[PDB]
């Protein structure tokens, strides 16, 4: 019994950090034009 | 000019914040594989 | 689930005296605009199972290898009409109709399996191009191992058919809904055909009125709790490993 | 997915009636505006195909080294008309019309590889200059490996061809529809027509009103959820890594 | 992308059924205001394209040591009109009009690297002094080793012209939009033509009231996300260093 | 950045036909108060031109030891007319008319050094006292090993000089402007225009309006960033001690 409940407990915290969304950014829609949403994505200085 | 205080007109992004659980989940890691190893390597953290 | 048509246009009577419908100003009786009546019907019957589910069907689908599209329509079903250019593979079920397929919900194998719905890269995925049809992928006639197919999905009542003829009884009609839906259909319909009559300041409000009174009485049906309702509980613990 | 013209024009009665477009003030019956109306009702099907996907539909492209620029127009698409300067390219998939992408969301390779689509910097990536074209740059024949594609759009359905001795029957032309959407597509034709007429207080506004409830009624549609909605499962776990 | 403008004038019917521009009062027929009419549609076409990207275009210019200023007009656009003081250095691309360059956004150079607009002090910066020009320091000649350029910028397309001839058909001329920014565009003519009209009460508030749909239309298309959007990934993984 | 005046005027006619500018009662036809619209139109110009860069320019002063102030006038400037009383010591740039100084942004010698503008207690500062004069002070000449400056500065077109026998044609005049600002210079005209006419409750209002639908059209082009906008990234790590 402490066997399978510590290997289900393991496998749900696996999950819940697994399968998010991790490492992607997220831009509202309409803060910034396309030559500002450039500029951002290449690294440099920007206006919003 | 007036209405746009500089604290919030200007921003100058930096690294996003690690959460608090992979730092846990790594230590959880490591420690079940010197507990299954028997060998504690001096190591996860400085050597001596 | 049934109701007498006689019933209905007799209740009616009582909120739609006010105009041609159903009355000459003198000496009350119901005229002869009872088809254009029983267009309405249909389609408030038809807005109310929209809102609550209150039914359901069941099809069985003959599985064919090498096929791409499987649509629903009513010339494929056994004991249809069988239009020559298409085999007749559902085999089981609700007589289908023009209006039967609201959405489908649940797809079950032969074998007791539940397979996936627009659920994308989910093992065995079936998609649904058209919200009629079922595309099926060739990766599920690689693993199936199911020879036949169950499909549940929400329906709506096909309408009975009036005739020139039937102007006679009218009355033998037999709508299709539980009573509570009938308080609610009243207004729905007497909002409807009193919407565009009236100059005055109080009677250019009617149509607004019973459309409140429609929408308040749809709540309170929701709050009795007077429609069908699964609730899941799953077991989680026969995988293996949750106990 | 159909309707008979006839059960909408019948319906559509009951809420033009105050108006030229359906009644002679003696007898009310229908007139012949049927060709403004129907060029009403096929506006209200596209937005209604805008609003919500209902569709989907499919290509497939043959390519060719050293192309720059494929458009997908239905001169290029195999049985249609074959205009001697262009080579015919897509050579199956749903008949192509005027109005029938209406915005591409998915690229799959013969090997079933997925590709990117206005993804700059990806590493494979296609780009559409002008909404119906595919842009493909050279680094993708470098490293390709397909010989066709696959593409998959939202569609809009082509609305069928009325003619001046069709004014016979009118009555055999097909909507495209389900019924759901065919009482939001009552409302907004209801307000179009409503809109230039009247000049009473209460008279002046049932275009409005009109807008109003067909809102609402796309929101309680919405609410319901009675169109097509995938929902992403990535795996994750077969990367090699993550378990 | 193209629409008959005959579907557009007959559609603005139902709309600009109030006034003068297309009816006769008796027997409400289209007058020949149609040129009038014709240039509004051009400024709407315009404005969508304004709002929204829908198009992008491209150019490629051949160098020449020692020059300061390239200005990007028609007359220096190969297969155009070869003005004699100006030599044509535009030899590749979209045939230049008077209103194609809204904006100029990507200059990429013959080895594939991307060079910068309007970044002071950046490496190698490139000038717009006059939104058309493109002013080249001496510098990105000493240090540049490309011997052409490629530029991208958002396109408005160039209307076509009608002709007194042309008067006969004007039903073979073809707007340049997707039927989409169709339905916005009826909003956008209808509230330009019936604002300077009227004196009553609620017949004075229309120009305003369209102006308002128009607003909404083009949330809603926004929202919907029916045009084009680049979305950047960088690789930030080959520079070396970074893994 | 041009325009023919011929459609500025066709299409203000359709938002200046309530008014005496452009209509006879009967069969409306342009009048001869063209000169008028004209000097409103280049008023309308210079505020666009005030609200956004849209242009830039370029002079280049030769230095004279012993000199305090410096005007930039056009009787200075080589080409212009040479007044006796002044050494012409604007040696290349721009032609100079009354108003195409809106602000001096940058003064780099030519050595490639920037010097400072305005910029009080700052090493080598240059003083502008009167708006259009460089003031320099003897500081300067003694730490100074430049011979020669470089100028830049906001821009203003200067307005095509109409003509009584130019009455003839009007439609060769070419306004110097993008056509998204075409779009907002139809608004402020009509604003100007309408603002003195009307008796009336809904027509007392016009002017108005379109005071704050310019305004609207300002904002939406600010947002949609449709001109000049240098960013500054300088490096800060050649200095020497930022690495």
Redesign the interface.
Known sequence: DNQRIIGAVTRG?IDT?ARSANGQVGVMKGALDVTNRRRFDRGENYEF | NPGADPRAAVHMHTFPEIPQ??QY?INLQQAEAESMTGVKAFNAGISG | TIQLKQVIDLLAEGELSNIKYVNIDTGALVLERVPSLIRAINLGVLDLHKRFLLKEGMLKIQLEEGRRLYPLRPAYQVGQKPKPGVPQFITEGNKLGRQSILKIEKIIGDNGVEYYLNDTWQPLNITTPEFDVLEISDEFYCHSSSKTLEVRYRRAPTPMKICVDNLDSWGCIDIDLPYTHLQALLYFVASRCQTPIGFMENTAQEGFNFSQKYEAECANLDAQNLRIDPVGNQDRFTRGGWV
């Open positions: 915290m950090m | 659980s992979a989940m």
